[PDB]
Design an enzyme around this catalytic site. Structure first.
Site, PDB file in Angstrom:
ATOM      1  N   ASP A 162       0.803  -1.207   0.000  1.00 43.08           N
ATOM      2  CA  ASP A 162       0.000   0.000   0.000  1.00 43.08           C
ATOM      3  C   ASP A 162       0.844   1.267   0.000  1.00 43.08           C
ATOM      4  O   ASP A 162       1.279   1.733   1.066  1.00 43.08           O
ATOM      5  CB  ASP A 162      -0.904  -0.015   1.228  1.00 43.08           C
ATOM      6  CG  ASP A 162      -1.967   1.060   1.211  1.00 43.08           C
ATOM      7  OD1 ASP A 162      -1.984   1.886   0.303  1.00 43.08           O
ATOM      8  OD2 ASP A 162      -2.837   1.037   2.100  1.00 43.08           O
ATOM      9  N   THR A 163       0.983   1.861  -1.183  1.00 41.48           N
ATOM     10  CA  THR A 163       1.654   3.132  -1.374  1.00 41.48           C
ATOM     11  C   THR A 163       0.973   4.298  -0.653  1.00 41.48           C
ATOM     12  O   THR A 163       1.599   5.322  -0.430  1.00 41.48           O
ATOM     13  CB  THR A 163       1.800   3.493  -2.875  1.00 41.48           C
ATOM     14  OG1 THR A 163       0.497   3.670  -3.452  1.00 41.48           O
ATOM     15  CG2 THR A 163       2.574   2.427  -3.640  1.00 41.48           C
ATOM     16  N   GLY A 164      -0.312   4.164  -0.319  1.00 43.13           N
ATOM     17  CA  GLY A 164      -1.065   5.227   0.367  1.00 43.13           C
ATOM     18  C   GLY A 164      -0.945   5.220   1.890  1.00 43.13           C
ATOM     19  O   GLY A 164      -1.502   6.094   2.563  1.00 43.13           O
TER      20      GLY A 164
HETATM   21  C1  LIG Z   1      -6.669   6.889   3.287  1.00 42.57           C
HETATM   22  C2  LIG Z   1      -5.153   6.798   3.145  1.00 42.57           C
HETATM   23  C3  LIG Z   1      -4.560   8.219   3.040  1.00 42.57           C
HETATM   24  C4  LIG Z   1      -4.472   5.991   4.264  1.00 42.57           C
HETATM   25  N1  LIG Z   1      -4.956   4.588   4.336  1.00 42.57           N
HETATM   26  C5  LIG Z   1      -4.310   3.647   3.394  1.00 42.57           C
HETATM   27  C6  LIG Z   1      -5.303   3.331   2.266  1.00 42.57           C
HETATM   28  O1  LIG Z   1      -4.597   2.695   1.201  1.00 42.57           O
HETATM   29  C7  LIG Z   1      -6.478   2.446   2.709  1.00 42.57           C
HETATM   30  C8  LIG Z   1      -6.096   0.986   3.012  1.00 42.57           C
HETATM   31  C9  LIG Z   1      -7.320   0.157   3.392  1.00 42.57           C
HETATM   32  C10 LIG Z   1      -7.773  -0.863   2.560  1.00 42.57           C
HETATM   33  C11 LIG Z   1      -8.907  -1.620   2.864  1.00 42.57           C
HETATM   34  C12 LIG Z   1      -9.592  -1.373   4.047  1.00 42.57           C
HETATM   35  C13 LIG Z   1      -9.131  -0.375   4.894  1.00 42.57           C
HETATM   36  C14 LIG Z   1      -8.002   0.401   4.582  1.00 42.57           C
HETATM   37  N2  LIG Z   1      -7.449   2.428   1.645  1.00 42.57           N
HETATM   38  C15 LIG Z   1      -8.635   3.032   1.687  1.00 42.57           C
HETATM   39  O2  LIG Z   1      -9.094   3.734   2.557  1.00 42.57           O
HETATM   40  O3  LIG Z   1      -9.369   2.823   0.481  1.00 42.57           O
HETATM   41  C16 LIG Z   1     -10.732   3.172   0.482  1.00 42.57           C
HETATM   42  C17 LIG Z   1     -10.952   3.724  -0.925  1.00 42.57           C
HETATM   43  O4  LIG Z   1     -11.026   2.520  -1.702  1.00 42.57           O
HETATM   44  C18 LIG Z   1     -11.620   1.464  -0.951  1.00 42.57           C
HETATM   45  O5  LIG Z   1     -10.853   0.248  -1.088  1.00 42.57           O
HETATM   46  C19 LIG Z   1     -10.199  -0.068   0.141  1.00 42.57           C
HETATM   47  C20 LIG Z   1     -10.954   0.712   1.221  1.00 42.57           C
HETATM   48  C21 LIG Z   1     -11.565   1.903   0.502  1.00 42.57           C
HETATM   49  S1  LIG Z   1      -5.219   4.042   5.861  1.00 42.57           S
HETATM   50  O6  LIG Z   1      -5.523   2.662   5.793  1.00 42.57           O
HETATM   51  O7  LIG Z   1      -6.336   4.807   6.386  1.00 42.57           O
HETATM   52  C22 LIG Z   1      -3.921   4.271   6.815  1.00 42.57           C
HETATM   53  C23 LIG Z   1      -3.721   5.375   7.648  1.00 42.57           C
HETATM   54  C24 LIG Z   1      -2.541   5.459   8.399  1.00 42.57           C
HETATM   55  C25 LIG Z   1      -1.585   4.433   8.272  1.00 42.57           C
HETATM   56  N3  LIG Z   1      -0.421   4.404   8.956  1.00 42.57           N
HETATM   57  C26 LIG Z   1      -1.789   3.371   7.447  1.00 42.57           C
HETATM   58  C27 LIG Z   1      -2.941   3.302   6.722  1.00 42.57           C
END
Ligand SMILES: CC(C)CN(C[C@@H](O)[C@H](Cc1ccccc1)NC(=O)O[C@H]1CO[C@H]2OCC[C@H]21)S(=O)(=O)c1ccc(N)cc1
Lengths: 99, 99
Positions: free
Chosen positions: A25-27
C-alpha cells in the site's frame, strides 16, 4: 516482480512467526497489521483514515518477510480490516510505482 | 515515471478543470476526493476505510488528469482525510508496483 492493479495487490507476509496476506500500500505511511499477540514493548498510538481513527500498538524493529524479501521496522497492531504494508517497509523491499 | 516511496507519492491532478494534490494509493480500490463542486449527476454511496464508513457522492465517467496522464472514471466525493487516487484509475494510467 511486477504487480498490476486490476486486483488488490495482496502478498504473503511472515510476521511474529505467522503467515498473513497483506496489501502493498503506497497510500499508507506506516505498516498496520491485524490484531495479533505480538511479543515485546509497544507504545499507544491512534491512526486515522477514511471513517476516522483506530487505536493501535506501535512496535519497533519488528522483522517481517514480505513476498520473500526481508524488512525490519515499525509495525502498528490493531483492529484494521486488512493487513497493510506501508511505505516504511515498502522502501526496504525496493518497491516502486511505475507508469 | 518511476516513483520511489521514501516520500508520499503525491501528484497534481486536474478534476473539474481545477488543479488539486492527490496521493497515489495502491491500497485504495476506489478514488476518493475531498468535498468540492463537480458538474453533473451523482449517486449516494457508502464506502469503508480503516476507521469505518462514510457517505460519498459517486460520480461516474469523470475526466481526470493525473500527473499529466488521462483517465475517465469513477470518483467518489466526500469526507476523506486525503485526496486518494485508487486502483480504478491507477490501472487506467498503466500503473504497476515493482520490486
Ligand atoms: C486513506 C489513506 C490516506 C491511508 N490509508 C491507506 C489506504 O490505502 C487504505 C487501506 C485500506 C484498505 C482496505 C480497508 C481499509 C483500509 N485504503 C482506503 O481507505 O481505500 C478506500 C478507498 O477505496 C476502498 O478500497 C479499500 C478501502 C476503501 S489508511 O488505511 O487509512 C492508513 C492510515 C494510516 C496508516 N499508517 C496506514 C494506513
Amino acid at each position: 516482480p511486477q504487480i498490476t492493479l486490476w486486483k488488490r495487490p495482496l502478498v504473503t507476509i511472515c510476521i511474529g512467526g505467522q503467515l498473513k496476506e497483506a496489501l502493498l500500500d503506497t497510500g499508507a505511511d506506516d505498516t498496520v497489521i491485524e490484531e495479533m499477540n505480538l511479543p515485546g514493548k509497544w507504545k499507544p498510538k491512534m491512526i486515522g483514515g477514511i471513517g476516522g481513527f483506530i487505536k493501535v500498538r506501535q512496535y519497533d524493529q519488528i522483522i517481517i518477510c514480505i513476498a520473500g524479501h526481508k524488512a525490519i521496522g515499525t509495525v502498528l497492531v490493531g483492529p484494521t480490516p486488512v493487513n497493510i504494508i506501508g511505505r516504511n517497509l515498502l522502501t526496504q523491499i525496493g518497491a516502486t510505482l511505475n507508469f
